[PDB]
Scaffold this motif. Structure first.
Motif, short mmCIF file in Angstrom:
data_model
loop_
_atom_site.label_atom_id
_atom_site.label_comp_id
_atom_site.label_asym_id
_atom_site.label_seq_id
_atom_site.Cartn_x
_atom_site.Cartn_y
_atom_site.Cartn_z
N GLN B 15 32.71 34.43 47.29
CA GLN B 15 34.01 34.96 46.98
C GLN B 15 35.13 34.54 47.74
N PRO B 16 36.29 34.80 46.49
CA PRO B 16 37.63 34.71 47.94
C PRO B 16 38.12 36.31 47.94
N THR B 17 39.29 36.47 48.86
CA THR B 17 39.52 37.66 48.18
C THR B 17 40.90 37.97 48.16
N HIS B 18 41.51 37.73 46.97
CA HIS B 18 43.04 37.55 46.41
C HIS B 18 43.14 38.99 45.82
N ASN B 19 44.14 40.19 46.01
CA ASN B 19 43.99 40.88 45.61
C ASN B 19 45.92 41.33 45.02
N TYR B 20 46.55 42.66 44.87
CA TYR B 20 47.28 43.13 44.92
C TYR B 20 47.32 44.28 45.76
N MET B 21 48.67 44.72 46.59
CA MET B 21 48.71 45.97 47.43
C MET B 21 49.80 46.65 46.51
N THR B 22 49.57 47.82 46.58
CA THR B 22 50.38 48.71 45.75
C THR B 22 50.93 50.23 46.94
N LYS B 23 51.79 49.94 47.19
CA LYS B 23 52.47 51.44 48.30
C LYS B 23 53.05 52.06 47.45
N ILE B 24 53.09 53.53 47.65
CA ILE B 24 53.54 54.88 47.03
C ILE B 24 54.63 55.07 48.31
#
Lengths: 49, 49, 49, 291, 44
Positions: B15-24
């Motif tokens: 697998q490759p890892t490609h994701n979204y980061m969300t910060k409050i």
């Protein structure tokens, strides 16, 4: 009373710019490409000394 | 975008890892104080003119 | 040791539209914040204005 | 306008079950360190009352509520908790709704003091804190209900559970951890009264030894009188000395310490207007402070 | 509920300090006379 659900500006675009020739490690190479290679079993190179 | 390498081993990367980061974000609120005296009120209003 | 300040951080997203430019120069890439007496040492020695 | 309103900010990260309990707790009594416009919720929670190390007991909660400042929560926004303090913010507005956590009903014209939840709970999971709300019960019961629970603790070393107010039953027993939570109040009673009833008994060496019902009254009346004959009716005048006069001062301070604790002053009086006089459990009651 | 920033360039000259370190120009100021001069505030 006012309630808001706000998503802000998605200020993150990660760019990757790759070229093997912009690297000068291709000085240490002889890069040629077969447009179709994998059919070949065994290529060989002859040296005469 | 997580950058990747095609490793020379034929073992799978699985697998490759490609994701979204969300910060409050956070929130803080500032403070000040301006206080005026008694007789300064009537002079600005005009009661002592 | 001063280079160790400049190389320990990654170039971070994202680019601004209004880059802090110099007179005839490239835009500013970082900000040091020092106390008053250290700044006198870092200008009479080790660096140029 | 000119009404004063404290604004308590909730840290973000609230789960949907957690905000529902905070939606429900509209009219309740909440303490705070200092009167201020904006303030975190960490100073509101029960965790903010600790000294160690140690979650504070019934004795410390009585001591804290003098130094803490009482406030009643108004409408609860999802952004912030708006609450008004009782001692400064109410002197201009005049009317604040207040919901009972008490099972005892409220008549009109009653004075109400605040009692820590010793008579017998909200905890937030996502924010990692607890909430304890004091009990707004009437002030003549407040000197009673505290003193009933002290009288049980002396029996630990007839029924005390009977308390009938305005035509209603009460069951103090209802158990386990309530007794040990109250243990520190019991010991400061007995140490105050027995030190009281030795020093008076040392300065007057024959209070108990004096004759019954007729000489004691004659000893009472001359002491009760106003006339100038005062000191010759009192005092009895190597070897160690009883440090009586130092034991006077240490007992008077300890008695003077408990005067602020167990007064339970009438912070709140309720004036019912356009409605029923009897205010029952779970009902908003209007509040008018002293002018 | 989605909104984007609007920016306009209006450049002015500012007296400052520029230091060349390595491969990039680095800004350097001290913040004593400009800010925190004659207050009750500690310098963080």
């Amino acid at each position: 009373d006012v309630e808001f659900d706000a998503l802000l500006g998605s200020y993150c675009n990660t760019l990757s710019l790759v070229r093997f020739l912009e690297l000068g490690l291709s000085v240490a190479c002889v890069c040629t490409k077969f447009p179709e290679l994998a059919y070949m079993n065994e290529g060989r190179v002859q040296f005469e000394v | 975008h997580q950058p990747l390498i095609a490793r020379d081993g034929p073992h799978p990367i699985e697998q490759p890892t490609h994701n979204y980061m969300t910060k409050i974000i956070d929130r803080r609120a500032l403070n000040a104080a301006f206080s005026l005296a008694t007789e300064a009120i009537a002079l600005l209003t005009g009661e002592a003119l | 040791w001063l280079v160790d300040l400049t190389t320990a951080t990654q170039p971070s997203v994202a680019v601004p539209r209004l880059t802090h430019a110099d007179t005839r120069g490239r835009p500013v890439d970082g900000v040091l914040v020092t106390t008053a007496p250290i700044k006198q040492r870092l200008l009479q020695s080790f660096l140029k204005v | 306008a000119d009404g004063f309103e404290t604004d308590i900010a909730i840290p973000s990260g609230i789960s949907r079950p957690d905000a529902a309990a905070l939606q429900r707790c509209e009219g309740r009594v909440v303490f705070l360190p200092t009167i201020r416009r904006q303030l975190t919720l960490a100073d509101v929670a029960h965790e903010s009352f600790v000294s160690g190390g140690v979650s504070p007991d019934t004795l410390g909660l009585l001591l804290a509520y003098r130094r803490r400042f009482p406030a009643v929560i108004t409408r609860v926004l999802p952004t912030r908790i708006v609450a008004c303090p009782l001692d400064v913010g109410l002197t201009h507005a005049g009317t604040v709704n207040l919901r009972n956590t008490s099972p005892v009903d409220l008549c009109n014209g009653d004075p109400i003091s605040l009692v820590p939840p010793v008579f017998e709970d909200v905890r937030l999971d996502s924010l990692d804190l607890t909430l304890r709300f004091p009990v707004p019960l009437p002030s003549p019961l407040a000197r009673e209900i505290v003193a009933r629970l002290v009288a049980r603790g002396i029996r630990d070393l007839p029924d005390l559970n009977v308390l009938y107010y305005n035509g209603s039953r009460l069951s103090l027993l209802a158990l386990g951890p309530v007794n040990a939570e109250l243990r520190s109040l019991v010991l400061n009673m007995v140490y105050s009264i027995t030190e009281g009833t030795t020093i008076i008994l040392t300065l007057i060496p024959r209070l108990f030894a004096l004759s019954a019902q007729d000489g004691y009254v004659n000893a009472l009346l001359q002491m009760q009188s106003v006339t100038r004959e005062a000191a010759q009716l009192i005092h009895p005048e190597g070897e160690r000395r009883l440090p009586l006069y130092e034991a006077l001062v240490a007992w008077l301070t300890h008695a003077g310490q408990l005067g602020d604790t167990l007064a339970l002053a009438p912070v709140v009086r309720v004036c019912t207007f356009d409605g029923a006089a009897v205010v029952r459990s779970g009902d908003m009651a209007p509040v008018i402070r002293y002018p | 509920t989605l909104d984007e920033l609007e920016s306009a360039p209006q450049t002015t000259r500012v007296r400052a300090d520029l230091v060349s370190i390595g491969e990039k120009l680095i800004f350097l100021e001290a913040l004593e006379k400009r800010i925190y001069a004659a207050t009750n505030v500690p310098y963080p």
